[PDB]
């Protein structure tokens, strides 16, 4: 009843160019089971939003991984929020949700918006740039850390212990074990920043420690809720902006409207979110049988959502595979559905809303002159070197 399909989803193969072969998984059924992982997939937008709006049945708690936590040991201690289950990963939520509200925005807003106007400033005197290193990198590097409140010494473990951490939920591949073995350093760098004597006041980490005396979390959690920020709040930016000036390269058409009206800038964002999918896959794991799509799933099975494959499945989607800066992108699982729906979007939001507004208000055309070269890993999509000509407006 379940088609087998040998498509390894953590092969370089794949990464290369997964489209193919996600079209390949949406049209071998709602659930196919993956022979080369021994886990179930499901690849169309309906079943994704399904298995992510039933935290029940397809829980977090045994890992995002493919690692299941109740026959394996986790490389790490577990996530008190990405990897908890209701009622236990409730209030942790709550906390992250009201250090990263609305409210946290408006304080931060000016300020991330000035670094993204001096950022494409200084791109602009250059002309020739790197778009991912010079940019993608550059402005979150220049706005991130120092809201989490993040000394200035260190920071070059940040990014490569986020790219461990988005390897580690894949399978135990090379990258997963090349990642692993290099770990000790970056770990032990962000783990002693998420102390609360090394959060600058005001920032995140500091907001985080101050929220441990309300009852919704103790002081012993708010370090590993600091380390959640610090785990997925950074490379998921540096590939969401890479992606959407990588798509105002490749569609200068939606370049020239996003010029004519800067206010289409968040939601140009929000549309590289979908359009590419800096998350484009992790697990759940049953709590039971269940019927899926027809399909009948037994209990403790890993189950692998592709999100990026959602986010371009026809079946929900109108020409899926265009970049579209007025698309009506709501729905889109680009940051997940339902309880674990991305704590942190606002803070994704704004900063690629006012780096495309700055794109949008500075700069005429974005060329790629050079080789691009993409960036491997497990669970992100993302490029490695994209070098664009900037010619200002
Ligand atoms: C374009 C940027 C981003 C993308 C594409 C993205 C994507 C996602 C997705 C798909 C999930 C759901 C995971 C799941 O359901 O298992 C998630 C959760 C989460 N994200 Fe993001 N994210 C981004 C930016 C950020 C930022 C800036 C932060 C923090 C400042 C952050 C912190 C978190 C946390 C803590 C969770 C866990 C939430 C929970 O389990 O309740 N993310 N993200
Ligand atoms: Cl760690």
């Avoid at 890992?63 to 299941?68: A, I, K, W, Y």
Wanted: aromatic share 8%; proline share 8%.
């Amino acid at each position: 009843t379940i088609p087998h399909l040998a498509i390894d989803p953590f092969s370089l193969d794949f990464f290369d160019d997964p489209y193919p072969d996600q079209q390949t998984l949406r049209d071998a059924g709602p659930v196919v089971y993956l022979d080369k992982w021994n886990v179930y997939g499901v690849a169309r937008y309906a079943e994704v939003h399904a298995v992510l709006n039933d935290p029940t049945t397809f829980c977090s708690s045994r890992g995002v991984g493919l690692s299941d936590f109740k026959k394996e040991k986790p490389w790490r201690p577990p996530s008190l929020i990405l990897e908890a289950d209701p009622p236990a990963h409730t209030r942790p939520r709550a906390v992250l949700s009201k250090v990263l509200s609305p409210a946290t925005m408006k304080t931060i807003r000016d300020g991330f918006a000035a670094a993204a106007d001096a950022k494409v400033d200084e791109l602009l005197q250059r002309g020739c740039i790197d778009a991912i290193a010079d940019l993608a990198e550059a402005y979150p590097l220049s706005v991130f850390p120092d809201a989490m409140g993040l000394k200035q010494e260190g920071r070059e473990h940040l990014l490569p212990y986020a790219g461990l951490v988005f390897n580690a939920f894949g399978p135990p591949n090379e990258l997963r074990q090349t990642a692993i073995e290099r770990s000790a350093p970056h770990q032990a760098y962000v783990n002693e920043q998420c102390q609360r004597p090394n959060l600058a006041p005001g920032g995140f980490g500091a907001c985080i420690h101050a929220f441990t005396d309300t009852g919704e979390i103790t002081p012993d959690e708010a370090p590993l809720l600091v380390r959640s920020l610090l785990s997925a709040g950074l490379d998921t930016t540096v590939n969401g902006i890479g992606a959407a000036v990588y798509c105002l390269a490749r569609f200068p058409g939606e370049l020239q409207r996003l010029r004519s009206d800067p206010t289409l800038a968040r939601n140009a964002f929000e549309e590289a979110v979908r359009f590419e999918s800096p998350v484009q896959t992790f697990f759940r794991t049953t709590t039971r049988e269940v019927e899926l799509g027809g399909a009948v799933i037994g209990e403790g099975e890993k189950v692998l959502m592709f999100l990026g494959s959602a986010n371009r499945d026809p079946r929900r989607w109108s020409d899926p595979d265009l970049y579209d800066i007025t698309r009506k992108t709501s729905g889109h699982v680009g940051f997940g559905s339902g309880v674990h729906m991305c704590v942190g979007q606002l803070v994704a939001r704004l900063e690629g809303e006012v780096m495309l507004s700055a794109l949008a208000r500075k700069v005429a055309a974005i060329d790629i002159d050079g080789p691009v070269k993409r960036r491997f890993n497990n669970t992100l999509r993302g490029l490695e070197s994209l070098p664009v000509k900037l010619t200002p407006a």
